Amino acid sequence: LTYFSARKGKRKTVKAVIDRFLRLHCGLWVRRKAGYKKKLWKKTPARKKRLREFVFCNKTQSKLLDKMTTSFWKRRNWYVDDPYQKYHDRTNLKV
Amino acid sequence: RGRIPGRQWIGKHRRPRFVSLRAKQNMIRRLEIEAENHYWLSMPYMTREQERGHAAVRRREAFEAIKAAATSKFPPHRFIADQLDHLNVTKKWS
Amino acid sequence: LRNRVTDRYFRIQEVLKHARHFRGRKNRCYRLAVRTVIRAFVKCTKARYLKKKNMRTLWINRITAASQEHGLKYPALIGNLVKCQVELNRKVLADLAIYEPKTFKSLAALASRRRHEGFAAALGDGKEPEGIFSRVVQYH
Amino acid sequence: KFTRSRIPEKVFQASPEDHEKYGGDPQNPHKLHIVTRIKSTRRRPYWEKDIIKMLGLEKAHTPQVHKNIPSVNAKLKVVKHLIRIKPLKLPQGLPAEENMSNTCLKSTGELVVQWHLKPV
Amino acid sequence: ARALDLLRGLPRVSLANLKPNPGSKKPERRPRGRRRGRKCG
Amino acid sequence: GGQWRLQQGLAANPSGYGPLTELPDWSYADGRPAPPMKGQLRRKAERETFARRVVLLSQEMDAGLQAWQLRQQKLQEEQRKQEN
Amino acid sequence: KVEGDIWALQKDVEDFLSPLLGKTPVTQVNEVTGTLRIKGYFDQELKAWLLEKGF
RNA sequence: ACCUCGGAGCAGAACCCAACCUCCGAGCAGUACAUGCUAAGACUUCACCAGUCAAAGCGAACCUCAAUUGAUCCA
RNA sequence: CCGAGCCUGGUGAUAGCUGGUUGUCCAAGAUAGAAUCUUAGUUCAACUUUAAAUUUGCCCACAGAACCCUCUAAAUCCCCUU
RNA sequence: GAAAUUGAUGGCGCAAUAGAUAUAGUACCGCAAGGGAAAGAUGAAAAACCAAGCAUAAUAUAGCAAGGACUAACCCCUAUACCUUCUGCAUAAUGAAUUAACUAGAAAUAACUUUGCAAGGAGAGCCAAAGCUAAGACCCCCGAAACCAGACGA
Numbered sequence A: 001l002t003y004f005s006a007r008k009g010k011r012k013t014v015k016a017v018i019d020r021f022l023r024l025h026c027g028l029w030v031r032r033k034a035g036y037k038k039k040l041w042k043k044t045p046a047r048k049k050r051l052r053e054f055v056f057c058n059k060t061q062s063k064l065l066d067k068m069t070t071s072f073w074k075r076r077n078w079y080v081d082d083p084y085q086k087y088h089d090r091t092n093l094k095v
Numbered sequence B: 001r002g003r004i005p006g007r008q009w010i011g012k013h014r015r016p017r018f019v020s021l022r023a024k025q026n027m028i029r030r031l032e033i034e035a036e037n038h039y040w041l042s043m044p045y046m047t048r049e050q051e052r053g054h055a056a057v058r059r060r061e062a063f064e065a066i067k068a069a070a071t072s073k074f075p076p077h078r079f080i081a082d083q084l085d086h087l088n089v090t091k092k093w094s
Numbered sequence C: 001l002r003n004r005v006t007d008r009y010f011r012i013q014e015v016l017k018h019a020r021h022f023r024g025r026k027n028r029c030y031r032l033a034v035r036t037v038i039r040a041f042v043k044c045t046k047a048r049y050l051k052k053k054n055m056r057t058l059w060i061n062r063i064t065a066a067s068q069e070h071g072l073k074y075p076a077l078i079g080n081l082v083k084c085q086v087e088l089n090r091k092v093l094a095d096l097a098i099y100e101p102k103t104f105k106s107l108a109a110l111a112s113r114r115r116h117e118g119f120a121a122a123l124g125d126g127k128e129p130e131g132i133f134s135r136v137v138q139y140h
Numbered sequence D: 001k002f003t004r005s006r007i008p009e010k011v012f013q014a015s016p017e018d019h020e021k022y023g024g025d026p027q028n029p030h031k032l033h034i035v036t037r038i039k040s041t042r043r044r045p046y047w048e049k050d051i052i053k054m055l056g057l058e059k060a061h062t063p064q065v066h067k068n069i070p071s072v073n074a075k076l077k078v079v080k081h082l083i084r085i086k087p088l089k090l091p092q093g094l095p096a097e098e099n100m101s102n103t104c105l106k107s108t109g110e111l112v113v114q115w116h117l118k119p120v
Numbered sequence E: 001a002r003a004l005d006l007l008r009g010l011p012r013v014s015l016a017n018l019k020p021n022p023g024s025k026k027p028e029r030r031p032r033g034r035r036r037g038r039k040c041g
Numbered sequence F: 001g002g003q004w005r006l007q008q009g010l011a012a013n014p015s016g017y018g019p020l021t022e023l024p025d026w027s028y029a030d031g032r033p034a035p036p037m038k039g040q041l042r043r044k045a046e047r048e049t050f051a052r053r054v055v056l057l058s059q060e061m062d063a064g065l066q067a068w069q070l071r072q073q074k075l076q077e078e079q080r081k082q083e084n
Numbered sequence G: 001k002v003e004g005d006i007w008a009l010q011k012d013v014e015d016f017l018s019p020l021l022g023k024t025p026v027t028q029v030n031e032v033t034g035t036l037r038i039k040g041y042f043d044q045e046l047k048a049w050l051l052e053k054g055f
Numbered sequence H: 001a002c003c004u005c006g007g008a009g010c011a012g013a014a015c016c017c018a019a020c021c022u023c024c025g026a027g028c029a030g031u032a033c034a035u036g037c038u039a040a041g042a043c044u045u046c047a048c049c050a051g052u053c054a055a056a057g058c059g060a061a062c063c064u065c066a067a068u069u070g071a072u073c074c075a
Numbered sequence I: 001c002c003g004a005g006c007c008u009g010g011u012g013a014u015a016g017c018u019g020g021u022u023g024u025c026c027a028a029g030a031u032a033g034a035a036u037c038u039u040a041g042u043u044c045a046a047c048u049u050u051a052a053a054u055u056u057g058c059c060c061a062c063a064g065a066a067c068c069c070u071c072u073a074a075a076u077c078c079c080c081u082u
Numbered sequence J: 001g002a003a004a005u006u007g008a009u010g011g012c013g014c015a016a017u018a019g020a021u022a023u024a025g026u027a028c029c030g031c032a033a034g035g036g037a038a039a040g041a042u043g044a045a046a047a048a049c050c051a052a053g054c055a056u057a058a059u060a061u062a063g064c065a066a067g068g069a070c071u072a073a074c075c076c077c078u079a080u081a082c083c084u085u086c087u088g089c090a091u092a093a094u095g096a097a098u099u100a101a102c103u104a105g106a107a108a109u110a111a112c113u114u115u116g117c118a119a120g121g122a123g124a125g126c127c128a129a130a131g132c133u134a135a136g137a138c139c140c141c142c143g144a145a146a147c148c149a150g151a152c153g154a
């Protein structure tokens, strides 16, 4: 990515990450499974159900996405009716 | 004359190695020691059932000490005396 | 040239002082003196083991010389002194050989005495009385 | 492939000839082993290295006392080619708190409880 | 306070006595010497 | 010659245990004993730890045997009690 | 924001928290900053305890 | 000549193992139209991507197959 | 010094390639693979380092892990004790 | 990569291989465009001990040239230069005649440490379900054949 923009000197955001992933304020990144819209006729119902699910990412993938997105995308967003509002914080998490 | 092809001790055609009486005696001595070891290991004091759990308390206490040491790791104290002692660097006479 | 080294003279001298007694340019040129001095210091460090080894070798050689003068061999002398329970080390034994020939002759006589006692014990193997010098003092 | 060695059980079944040779009665077996590492763990498998570390025999020629129990015996069987095992002997019995500071392990394997450093 | 009494006892505080709080100033690592030189990490 | 020393029961190395090393190297001309040597103090500490471990292991094994005997009892008289 | 005998405060905190935690809590007494740091979350308990003490 | 996938030896027994090593195969077909929806817990081709199995529940009735395939963007 | 002149400039071109990478001292530290116009490289694993939280980590007793195949290895996995 | 919108008196520099290329765009080089240097040090008045290299002082059997030493320089014993690269180098693989000077780790994200304040922090903006603010601390040098633009050249 661009660590220092030529016009502002700031760090830039890779907009592919913004277009593909959702960041939960807790630090988790949600994503859709690849191939969930491809060749569904040859995929079993269990496979389709698996592919139609929203999925988290590794620690390393989360760190990569955090590096590739700027701090603006890691802020606390109080949207009106966010379907992921309840998922923005962790509960009963030990270490 | 009398060349060993390639490197000694590794190739197909290695330099011949011959065991001396010294080496034979050394190996025999080690074998005797190990035979005595076999003898002294062939006579257990307790059986497995008898030994079962006879050191459990001590092992548990040792691990508890290890856990306490691990979990007591925490930054050391800081003292106003230590901070103020640095003023002495410019201590002078009169 | 905001910051420049001004001690380079003394930094070079710290090595040239140890290199002064070398041969050729190794005592004058730092690029060479540093290598030679590092090698010299490594040799000096490694030479302590060799010093001890060579001291023991010299002591063994001198003890062998004296024992041969008295008709004994070094292994016999050392082993029989140990059996007599005299714990003189090789350094002291060589010192006695050089400087106390009569004491070393006495020690060699004792070693040969114990050797002959051992030979007699082996020959008459059994419960025969132990040799006078063969008897070992017991410590508890 | 080189693998861990399973010693057949018959190896550790002493015979009357062995009892006579080594001076140990099958009945009333000794309680404790004195174990000394007489061989390097270098050029030996990592499992033998780990067993030596577990037994605490990192230093060579340093006697260590161990229980004569089946599990310790199994470890000693694993690393038997690197160690010398002898029976600990107590001519004066177990040391007491009074004489705990006067003990010495003689080369014969006896833990004398009085060490006067004087001629008998 | 005991700290103020210790100040009264101690020499004057000047610009030759100031020191950063220990742990606040990490040492700077630069590629010179055997350990940090050569390939420089 | 360490084999002979081992046979006689002394340390294979004369620098090991024995009067030659464990005795004080010196004393004041007045006769007052010298402070214990550092090596001797370390050796005494090591022997004390060894003896304490010997006692601990023997006591643990004896306690284990006693506990096993007691368990065998409990089992025997239980079996008898619910047999009766 | 501790003023006075931070060590007395540490002793009192240890006495108060040992029955709760089961062992003496591990703490750092930053005398220079006048602060007491205790390993583990005890914010609510310590707030209630300090209210009882009257601070 | 080969490049992806699966089976068997090498690799005898938890797993995993190379080779321009040895041999077989695949790039479907068939049946069904609940081959629907959801959901604990697990497996995982040594990463990820991907791929697997599945209790309970709703709604109903009263899948076979070793491989039999291809991401994103874009249409 | 023409497979396409020379000079200046873009230009500090770029180079997975070679070379170099300068005080002292201590400590930990050599580990499977996958993908890749990729096998002279890189990313993820694995290993390694540091700090922190916690409690089990290693060794391992029985019992247990398939027929095909008539026989069929050194072993392995799992595993309380210790 | 926006906009609406907001509001806005010298040197912890160099001091002749540094700092301008500059004592000078001179000398010199090229047909031309163009390239491009080096260096000087007394004093108030001149109308007053230290690099390399050598010489003093060539050389004595044997050997990475030193170390252990020794009464003794050598003789005795031990010792396969360094750097880079590599599976592995004394390697008959690279570099180095040598002295002096110059010559090569720049920084965000996120964390860690230390302060301050604290459900708030920050000297508008920003962040916040103990956070926020401030500081500390990690990211080199030389090298192509090339490509393009404009000049200069028969």
Ligand SMILES: Nc1nc2c(ncn2[C@@H]2O[C@H](COP(=O)(O)OP(=O)(O)OP(=O)(O)O)[C@@H](O)[C@H]2O)c(=O)[nH]1
Pocket (backbone or CB within 6 Å): J009, J010
């Ligand atoms: N920062 C800075 N200050 C300067 C500079 N030249 C002059 N000054 C400042 O100008 C002020 C006046 O300079 P003087 O020479 O005393 O007076 P002056 O000739 O009337 O000044 P000017 O009007 O500035 O030419 C002082 O504060 C100087 O430090 C410069 O180059 N930089």
Ligand SMILES: [Mg+2]
Pocket (backbone or CB within 6 Å): B004, B005, B006, B007, B008
């Ligand atoms: Mg050869």
Ligand SMILES: [Mg+2]
Pocket (backbone or CB within 6 Å): E034, E035
């Ligand atoms: Mg290093």
Ligand SMILES: [Mg+2]
Pocket (backbone or CB within 6 Å): H044
């Ligand atoms: Mg996996």
Ligand SMILES: [Mg+2]
Pocket (backbone or CB within 6 Å): none
């Ligand atoms: Mg031409």
Ligand SMILES: [Mg+2]
Pocket (backbone or CB within 6 Å): none
């Ligand atoms: Mg470059």
Ligand SMILES: [Mg+2]
Pocket (backbone or CB within 6 Å): none
């Ligand atoms: Mg180390």
Ligand SMILES: [Mg+2]
Pocket (backbone or CB within 6 Å): none
């Ligand atoms: Mg604007």
Ligand SMILES: [Mg+2]
Pocket (backbone or CB within 6 Å): none
């Ligand atoms: Mg200049």
Ligand SMILES: [Mg+2]
Pocket (backbone or CB within 6 Å): none
């Ligand atoms: Mg000179």
Ligand SMILES: [Mg+2]
Pocket (backbone or CB within 6 Å): none
């Ligand atoms: Mg040559």
Ligand SMILES: [Mg+2]
Pocket (backbone or CB within 6 Å): none
């Ligand atoms: Mg060369």
Ligand SMILES: [Mg+2]
Pocket (backbone or CB within 6 Å): J094
């Ligand atoms: Mg080369």
Ligand SMILES: [Mg+2]
Pocket (backbone or CB within 6 Å): none
């Ligand atoms: Mg050359």
Ligand SMILES: [Mg+2]
Pocket (backbone or CB within 6 Å): none
């Ligand atoms: Mg013409």
